[PDB]
Structure 1
């Protein structure tokens, strides 16, 4: 049994009073952190505020980390600084950062190396576009993307994979649980081949497409879906029910 993993990616949202209440509207929900991981990823300038308000059962992290260490990189947050602040998790390679800020697989690899080097846990995202899927390149692109960083994973509890089906985000199309499952299986096989069977069976793989209260239960019951990276729906108080689906 892999520990399930449910993550709130607030993205660029929130406003002091908004957090505060939502963090309290969580919080009341009882769960055991020894059996289920729950991580909240607020905006960097909300981290301290959100960490204080959330109870120890909730893990926290930030939505990006630098590929450079400390030094002359205006605007960046190093893994070193994140370590010092006891920031536990980092998100790496999110589709939005690949798209809008030109993050490559080389960046993902380097960000992951830096994060592990400073005892950080990494939520690493990847996935294929619609036209890559239309040409039966799903397995090809995902293999390339995963192989870009997968040889760096030391402890397989501390690195968590996220499949974001870019092909069914802002495109019209929509992924069924069976399709997600089939890709998740393939992702696990890639980890099996490159790292070993035990490591592949240990590693959490989350679904990072559109997750809400309506579809969450039918996704988590899939064999190789171990949780979610939730966006839009993690801004709502009902997110607590998405946590209950993995409970």
Structure 2
């Protein structure tokens, strides 16, 4: 059976003091990291503070990684640098980077290639817009986005997919757990047909829409939903209840 994976994407949020308070609350939750992956993704300049404050049962990662290696790339963090710091996970392709920073499918591919070369684990995000869903192109779009990078995956425990239902983010539309499940099953089929059945059955596919204490249980119970990449709710001490839903 697939190991569930609950991730806190703190995005661009936090102070040293707020992180102290929050990590303390997180540490109070008793869970078994051999059975459940729980990963916190602080801002880069908060990583050291966050890693020192969280018990090892919490895995940690960063919210982006360079498509380039070491060298003359001012402002970038290479996979090689991340590995030297023992940063375990990277987020790649988050919708906010595709939107504000014009990150492309090819950028996602190059970031994944660099990450896997340097023995990092990657949380790779994709998903269709409102316009794309309205045009009945959900499968077309997700197939293209996944096929941009999927051949790079060698170990299907080390790459974790995230479906962001962008059609239901800031649009006034909401995704039901069943609607999420349908897309997750479609994603797993795409992996099966491009990689193989064993590979598809191994890979974690997380929901990256709006997750909170009220809907987490309904989402995690869906057959093809293996966890979540959680936004605003992961900034609250009640995030521990979201973790509990996957325990």
Q: TM-score, normalised by structure 1?
A: 1.00
CA shift, 1:220, in A, is 0.2
CA shift, 1:202, in A, is 0.2
CA shift, 1:21, in A, is 1.1
User: d(CA) in 2 for partners of 1:178 and 1:226?
Assistant: 14
User: d(CA) in 2 for partners of 1:238 and 1:178?
Assistant: 24
User: d(CA) in 2 for partners of 1:72 and 1:19?
Assistant: 32
Matches within 5 A, 1:43-122: 43-122=43-122
CA shift, 1:112, in A, is 0.1
> Runs of 5+ in structure 1 lacking a partner?
none
SS at match of 2:242: helix
User: d(CA) in 2 for partners of 1:155 and 1:240?
Assistant: 29
SS at match of 1:5: strand
Offset from partner CA, 1:32-52 (integer Å, 9 cap, x none) = 111000000000000000000
Offset from partner CA, 1:122-172 (integer Å, 9 cap, x none) = 000000000100111000000000000000001000000000000000000
Offset from partner CA, 1:72-125 (integer Å, 9 cap, x none) = 000000000000000000000000000000000000000000000000000000
SS at match of 1:123: strand
User: d(CA) in 2 for partners of 1:136 and 1:63?
Assistant: 31
SS at match of 1:20: helix
User: d(CA) in 2 for partners of 1:142 and 1:2?
Assistant: 22
User: d(CA) in 2 for partners of 1:15 and 1:172?
Assistant: 30
User: d(CA) in 2 for partners of 1:27 and 1:227?
Assistant: 20
SS at match of 1:17: helix
User: d(CA) in 2 for partners of 1:54 and 1:20?
Assistant: 9
Two-structure CA RMSD over aligned residues (Å): 0.3
User: d(CA) in 2 for partners of 1:46 and 1:214?
Assistant: 29
SS at match of 2:132: helix
SS at match of 1:162: strand
User: d(CA) in 1 for partners of 2:86 and 2:178?
Assistant: 38
SS at match of 1:18: helix
Offset from partner CA, 1:17-61 (integer Å, 9 cap, x none) = 000110010011001111000000000000000000000100000
Matches within 5 A, 1:1-247: 1-247=1-247
User: d(CA) in 2 for partners of 1:134 and 1:55?
Assistant: 44
User: d(CA) in 1 for partners of 2:239 and 2:246?
Assistant: 12
> Runs of 5+ in structure 2 lacking a partner?
none
User: d(CA) in 2 for partners of 1:14 and 1:173?
Assistant: 28
CA shift, 1:71, in A, is 0.3
SS at match of 2:49: helix
User: d(CA) in 1 for partners of 2:116 and 2:50?
Assistant: 24
User: d(CA) in 1 for partners of 2:56 and 2:207?
Assistant: 25
